[PDB]
Coordinates of N, CA and C and ligand atoms in Angstrom, one line a residue:
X1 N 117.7 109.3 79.3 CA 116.5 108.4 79.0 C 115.3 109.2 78.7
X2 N 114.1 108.5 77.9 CA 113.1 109.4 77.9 C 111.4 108.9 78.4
X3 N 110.7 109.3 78.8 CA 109.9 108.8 79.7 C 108.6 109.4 78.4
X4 N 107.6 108.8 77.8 CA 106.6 109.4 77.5 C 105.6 108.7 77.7
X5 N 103.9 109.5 77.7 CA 103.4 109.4 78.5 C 101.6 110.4 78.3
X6 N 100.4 109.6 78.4 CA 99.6 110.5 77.9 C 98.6 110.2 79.3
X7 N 97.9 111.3 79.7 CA 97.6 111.7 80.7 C 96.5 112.8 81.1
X8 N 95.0 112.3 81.1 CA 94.0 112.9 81.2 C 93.5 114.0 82.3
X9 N 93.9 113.3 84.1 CA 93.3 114.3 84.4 C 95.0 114.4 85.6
X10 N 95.8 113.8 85.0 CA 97.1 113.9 85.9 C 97.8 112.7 86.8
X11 N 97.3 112.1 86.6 CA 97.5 110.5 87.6 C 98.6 110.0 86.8
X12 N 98.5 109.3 85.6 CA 99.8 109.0 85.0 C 101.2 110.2 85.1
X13 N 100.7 111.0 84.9 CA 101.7 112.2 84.9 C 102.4 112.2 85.6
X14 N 101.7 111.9 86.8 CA 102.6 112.0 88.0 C 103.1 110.7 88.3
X15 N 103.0 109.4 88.3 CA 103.7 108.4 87.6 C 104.9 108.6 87.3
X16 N 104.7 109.0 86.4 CA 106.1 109.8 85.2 C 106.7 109.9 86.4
X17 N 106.6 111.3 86.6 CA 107.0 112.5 87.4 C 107.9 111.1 88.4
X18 N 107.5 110.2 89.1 CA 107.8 109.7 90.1 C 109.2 108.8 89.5
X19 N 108.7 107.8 88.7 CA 109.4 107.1 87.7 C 111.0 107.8 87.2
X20 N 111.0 108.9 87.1 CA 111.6 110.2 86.8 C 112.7 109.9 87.8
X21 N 112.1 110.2 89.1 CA 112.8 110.5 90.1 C 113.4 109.4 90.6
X22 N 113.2 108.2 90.2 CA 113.9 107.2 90.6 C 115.0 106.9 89.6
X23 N 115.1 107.4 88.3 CA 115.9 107.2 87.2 C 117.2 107.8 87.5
X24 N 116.6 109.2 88.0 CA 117.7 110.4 88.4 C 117.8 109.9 89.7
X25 N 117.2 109.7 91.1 CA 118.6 109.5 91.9 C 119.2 108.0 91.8
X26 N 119.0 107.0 90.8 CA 120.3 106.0 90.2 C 121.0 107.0 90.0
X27 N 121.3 108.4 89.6 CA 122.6 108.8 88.9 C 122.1 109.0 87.1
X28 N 121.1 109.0 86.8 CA 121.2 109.0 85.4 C 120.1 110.0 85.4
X29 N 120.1 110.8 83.5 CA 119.7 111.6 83.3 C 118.4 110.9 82.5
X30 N 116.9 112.1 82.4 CA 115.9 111.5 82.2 C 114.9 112.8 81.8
X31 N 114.1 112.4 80.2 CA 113.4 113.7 80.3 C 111.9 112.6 80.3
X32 N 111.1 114.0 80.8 CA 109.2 113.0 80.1 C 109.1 114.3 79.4
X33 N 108.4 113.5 78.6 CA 107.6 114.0 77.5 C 106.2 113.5 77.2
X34 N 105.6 114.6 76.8 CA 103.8 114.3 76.9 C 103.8 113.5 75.2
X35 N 102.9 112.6 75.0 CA 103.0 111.7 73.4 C 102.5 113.2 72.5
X36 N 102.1 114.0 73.0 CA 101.9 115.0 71.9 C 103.1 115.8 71.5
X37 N 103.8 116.0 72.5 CA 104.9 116.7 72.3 C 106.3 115.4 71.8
X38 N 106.1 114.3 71.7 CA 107.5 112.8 71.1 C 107.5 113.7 69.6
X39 N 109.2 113.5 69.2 CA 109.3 113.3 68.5 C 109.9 111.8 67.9
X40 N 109.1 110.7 66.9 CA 109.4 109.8 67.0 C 111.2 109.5 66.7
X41 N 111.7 110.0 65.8 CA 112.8 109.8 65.5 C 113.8 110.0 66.8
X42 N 113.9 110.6 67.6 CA 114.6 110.9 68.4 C 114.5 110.0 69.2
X43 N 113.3 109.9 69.6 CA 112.8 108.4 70.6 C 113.1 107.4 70.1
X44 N 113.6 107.1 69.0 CA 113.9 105.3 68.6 C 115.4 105.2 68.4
X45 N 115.8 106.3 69.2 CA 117.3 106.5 69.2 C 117.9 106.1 70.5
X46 N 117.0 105.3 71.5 CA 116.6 105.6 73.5 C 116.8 103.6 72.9
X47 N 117.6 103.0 73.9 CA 117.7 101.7 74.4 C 116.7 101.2 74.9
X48 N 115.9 101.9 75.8 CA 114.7 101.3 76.6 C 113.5 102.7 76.3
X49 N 112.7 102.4 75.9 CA 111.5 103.0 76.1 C 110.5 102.8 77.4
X50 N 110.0 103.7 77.8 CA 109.4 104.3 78.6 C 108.0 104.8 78.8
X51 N 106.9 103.8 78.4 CA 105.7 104.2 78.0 C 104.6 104.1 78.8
X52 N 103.5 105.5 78.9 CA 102.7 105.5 80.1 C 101.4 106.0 79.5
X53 N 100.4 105.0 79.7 CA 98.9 105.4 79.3 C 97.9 105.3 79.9
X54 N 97.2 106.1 80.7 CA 96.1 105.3 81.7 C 95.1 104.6 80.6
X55 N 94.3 103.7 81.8 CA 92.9 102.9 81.0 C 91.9 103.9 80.1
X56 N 91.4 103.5 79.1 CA 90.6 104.7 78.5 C 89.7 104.1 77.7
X57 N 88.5 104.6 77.9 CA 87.3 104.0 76.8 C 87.3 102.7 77.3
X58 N 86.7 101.8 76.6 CA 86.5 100.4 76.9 C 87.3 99.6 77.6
X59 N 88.6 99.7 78.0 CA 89.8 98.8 78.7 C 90.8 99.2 77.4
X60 N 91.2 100.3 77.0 CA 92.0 100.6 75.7 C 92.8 101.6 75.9
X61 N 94.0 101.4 75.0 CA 94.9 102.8 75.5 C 93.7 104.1 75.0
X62 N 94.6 105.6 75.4 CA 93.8 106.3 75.0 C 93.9 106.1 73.5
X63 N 92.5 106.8 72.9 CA 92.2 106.6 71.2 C 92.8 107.8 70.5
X64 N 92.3 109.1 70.9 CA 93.3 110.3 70.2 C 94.4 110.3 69.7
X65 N 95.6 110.2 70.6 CA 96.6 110.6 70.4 C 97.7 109.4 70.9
X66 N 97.4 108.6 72.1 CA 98.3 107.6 72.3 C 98.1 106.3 71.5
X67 N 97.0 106.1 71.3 CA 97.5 104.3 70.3 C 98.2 104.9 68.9
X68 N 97.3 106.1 67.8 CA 98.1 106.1 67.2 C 100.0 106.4 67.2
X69 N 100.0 107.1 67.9 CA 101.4 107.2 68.3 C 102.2 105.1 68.6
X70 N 101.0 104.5 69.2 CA 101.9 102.9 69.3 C 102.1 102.8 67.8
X71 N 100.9 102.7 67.2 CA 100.7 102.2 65.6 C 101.7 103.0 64.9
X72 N 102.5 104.4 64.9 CA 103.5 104.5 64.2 C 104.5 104.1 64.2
X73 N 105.0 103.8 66.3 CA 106.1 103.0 66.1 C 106.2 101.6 65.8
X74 N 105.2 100.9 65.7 CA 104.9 99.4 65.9 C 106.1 98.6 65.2
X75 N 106.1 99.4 64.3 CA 106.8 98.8 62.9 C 108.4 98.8 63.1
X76 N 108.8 99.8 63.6 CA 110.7 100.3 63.8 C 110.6 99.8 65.1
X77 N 110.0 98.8 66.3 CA 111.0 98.7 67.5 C 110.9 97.4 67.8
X78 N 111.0 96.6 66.8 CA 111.3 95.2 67.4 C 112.6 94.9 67.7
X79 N 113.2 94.5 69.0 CA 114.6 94.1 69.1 C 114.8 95.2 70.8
X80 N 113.8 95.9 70.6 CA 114.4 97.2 71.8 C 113.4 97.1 73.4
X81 N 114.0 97.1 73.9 CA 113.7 97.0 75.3 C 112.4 98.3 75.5
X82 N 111.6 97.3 76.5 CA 110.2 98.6 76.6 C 109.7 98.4 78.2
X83 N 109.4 99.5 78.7 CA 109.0 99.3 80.8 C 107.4 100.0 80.1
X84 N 106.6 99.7 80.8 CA 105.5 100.0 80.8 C 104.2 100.4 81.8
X85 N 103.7 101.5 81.9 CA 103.4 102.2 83.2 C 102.1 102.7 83.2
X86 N 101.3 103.0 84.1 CA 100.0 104.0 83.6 C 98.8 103.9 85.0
X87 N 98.0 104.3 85.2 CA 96.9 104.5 85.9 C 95.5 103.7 85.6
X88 N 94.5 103.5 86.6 CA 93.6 102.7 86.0 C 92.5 103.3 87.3
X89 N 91.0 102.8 87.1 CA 90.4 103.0 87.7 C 89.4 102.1 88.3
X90 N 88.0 101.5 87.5 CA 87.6 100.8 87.7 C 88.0 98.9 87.6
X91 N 88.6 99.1 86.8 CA 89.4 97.7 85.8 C 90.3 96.9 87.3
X92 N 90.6 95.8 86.6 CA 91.7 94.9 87.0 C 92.7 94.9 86.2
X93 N 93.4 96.0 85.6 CA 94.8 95.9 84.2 C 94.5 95.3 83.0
X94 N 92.9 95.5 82.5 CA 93.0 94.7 80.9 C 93.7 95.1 80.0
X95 N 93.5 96.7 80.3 CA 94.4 97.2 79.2 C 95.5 97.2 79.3
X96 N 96.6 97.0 80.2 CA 98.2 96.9 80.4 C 98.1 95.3 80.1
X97 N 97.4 94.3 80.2 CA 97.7 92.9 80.2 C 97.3 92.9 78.3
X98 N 96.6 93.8 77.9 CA 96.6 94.0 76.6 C 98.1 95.0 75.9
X99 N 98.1 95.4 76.2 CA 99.5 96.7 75.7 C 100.4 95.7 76.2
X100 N 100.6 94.9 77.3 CA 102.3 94.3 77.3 C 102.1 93.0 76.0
X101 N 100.9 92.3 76.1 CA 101.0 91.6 74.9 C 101.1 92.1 73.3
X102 N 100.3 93.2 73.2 CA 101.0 94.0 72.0 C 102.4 94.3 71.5
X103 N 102.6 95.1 73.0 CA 104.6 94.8 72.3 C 105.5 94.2 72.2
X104 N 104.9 92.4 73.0 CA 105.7 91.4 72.4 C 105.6 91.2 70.9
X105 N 103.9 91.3 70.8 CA 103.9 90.9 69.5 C 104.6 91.9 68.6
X106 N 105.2 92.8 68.7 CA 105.4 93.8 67.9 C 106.9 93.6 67.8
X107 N 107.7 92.5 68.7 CA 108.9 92.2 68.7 C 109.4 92.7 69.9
X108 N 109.3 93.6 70.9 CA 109.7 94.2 71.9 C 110.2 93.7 72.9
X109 N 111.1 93.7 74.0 CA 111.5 92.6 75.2 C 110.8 93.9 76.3
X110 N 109.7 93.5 77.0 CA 109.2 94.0 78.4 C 110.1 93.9 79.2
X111 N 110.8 94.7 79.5 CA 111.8 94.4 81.0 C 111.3 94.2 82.1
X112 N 110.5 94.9 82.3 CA 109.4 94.5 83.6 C 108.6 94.3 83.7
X113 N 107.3 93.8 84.8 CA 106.3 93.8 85.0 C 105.9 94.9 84.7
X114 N 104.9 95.3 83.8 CA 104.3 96.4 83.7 C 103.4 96.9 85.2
X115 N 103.9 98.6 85.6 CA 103.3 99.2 86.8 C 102.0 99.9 86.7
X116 N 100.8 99.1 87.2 CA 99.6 100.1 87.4 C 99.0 100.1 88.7
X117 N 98.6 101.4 88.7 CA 98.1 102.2 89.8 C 96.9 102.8 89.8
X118 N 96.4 101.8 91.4 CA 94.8 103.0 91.0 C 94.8 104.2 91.3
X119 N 93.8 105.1 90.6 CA 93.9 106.7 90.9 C 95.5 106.9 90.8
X120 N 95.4 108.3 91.5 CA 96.4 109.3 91.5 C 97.2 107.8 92.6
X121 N 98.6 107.9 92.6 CA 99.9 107.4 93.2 C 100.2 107.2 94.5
X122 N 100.1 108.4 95.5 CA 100.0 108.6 96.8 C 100.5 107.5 97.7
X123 N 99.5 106.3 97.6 CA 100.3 105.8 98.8 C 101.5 104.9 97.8
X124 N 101.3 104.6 96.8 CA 102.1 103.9 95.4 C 103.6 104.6 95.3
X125 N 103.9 105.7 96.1 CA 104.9 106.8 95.4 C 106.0 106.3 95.3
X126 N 106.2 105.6 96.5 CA 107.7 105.0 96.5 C 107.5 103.5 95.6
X127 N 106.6 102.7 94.9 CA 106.6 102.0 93.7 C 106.8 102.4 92.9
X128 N 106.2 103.7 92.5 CA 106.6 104.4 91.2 C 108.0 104.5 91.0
X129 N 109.0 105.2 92.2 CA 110.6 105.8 92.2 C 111.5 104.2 92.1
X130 N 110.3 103.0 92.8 CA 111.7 101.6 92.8 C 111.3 101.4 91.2
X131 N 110.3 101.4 90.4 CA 110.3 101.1 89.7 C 111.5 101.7 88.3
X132 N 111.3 103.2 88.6 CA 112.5 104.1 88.0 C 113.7 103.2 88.3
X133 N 114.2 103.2 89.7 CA 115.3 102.5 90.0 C 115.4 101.2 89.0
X134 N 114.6 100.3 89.2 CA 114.9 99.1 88.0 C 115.4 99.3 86.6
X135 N 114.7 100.2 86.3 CA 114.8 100.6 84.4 C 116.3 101.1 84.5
X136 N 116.4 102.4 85.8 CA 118.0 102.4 85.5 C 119.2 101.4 85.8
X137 N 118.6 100.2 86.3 CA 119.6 99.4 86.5 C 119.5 98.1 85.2
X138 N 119.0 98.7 84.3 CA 119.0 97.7 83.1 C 120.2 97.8 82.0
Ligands
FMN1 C1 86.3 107.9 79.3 C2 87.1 107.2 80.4 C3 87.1 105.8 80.3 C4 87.9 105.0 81.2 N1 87.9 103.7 81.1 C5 88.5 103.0 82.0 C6 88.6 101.5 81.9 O1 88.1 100.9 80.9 N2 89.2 100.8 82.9 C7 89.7 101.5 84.1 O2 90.0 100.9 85.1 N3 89.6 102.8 84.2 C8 89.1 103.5 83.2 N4 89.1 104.9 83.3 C9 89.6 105.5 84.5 C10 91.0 106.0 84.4 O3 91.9 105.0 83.9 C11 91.5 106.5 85.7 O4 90.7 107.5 86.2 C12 93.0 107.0 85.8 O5 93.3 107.3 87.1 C13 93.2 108.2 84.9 O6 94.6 108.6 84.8 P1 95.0 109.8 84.0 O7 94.8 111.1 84.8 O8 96.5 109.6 83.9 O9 94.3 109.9 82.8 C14 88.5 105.7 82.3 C15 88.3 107.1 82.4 C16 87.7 107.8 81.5 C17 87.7 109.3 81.6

């Protein structure tokens, strides 16, 4: 499976990292990858996607490098399963209650409740790993 994921000062990252670890002790194999380093084709080869962006700018994914990265796949993943994950700070989840509606509209099936977390994970850690557990039991 593959887990990617954009990540400013480390808080989603470690999300990942956690998410990760819940995939692998289900028994299954799992890489993250930072959205700079995805290559798209390889990723639209994955059953379930795996996408993690904290809040940024105005209640919006990040602008650099994670929305365009949504906008290129928008187009190729209607039909495919997507878990959705990321960090937040001051907000109440606009921007994940915005991103899970985007990739319905985009044709996508949300398998889960999208997971956000304030700040860094800590007391969250074991949400992060049951969360991994769910995705691998899909
Ligand atoms: C420029 C900027 C804008 C942000 N905008 C929001 C926002 O609109 N809503 C929110 O709750 N948090 C916002 N945050 C806070 C981050 O979402 C939060 O600190 C999160 O823990 C960062 O995770 P990361 O290390 O994975 O980037 C913003 C942070 C920065 C630096």
């Amino acid at each position: 499976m593959k887990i990617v994921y954009w990540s400013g000062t480390g808080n989603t990252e470690k999300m990942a990292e956690l998410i990760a670890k819940g995939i692998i002790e289900s028994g299954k194999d799992v890489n993250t990858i930072n959205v700079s380093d995805v290559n798209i084709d390889e990723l639209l080869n994955e059953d379930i996607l795996i996408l993690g962006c904290s809040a940024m700018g105005p209640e919006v994914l990040e602008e650099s490098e994670f929305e365009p990265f949504i906008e290129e796949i928008s187009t190729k993943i209607s039909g495919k399963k997507v878990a959705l994950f990321g960090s937040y700070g001051w907000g109440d989840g606009k921007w994940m209650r915005d991103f899970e509606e985007r990739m319905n509209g985009y044709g996508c099936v949300v398998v889960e409740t999208p997971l956000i977390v304030q700040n860094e994970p800590d007391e969250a850690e074991q949400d992060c790993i049951e969360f991994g557990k769910k995705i691998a039991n899909i």
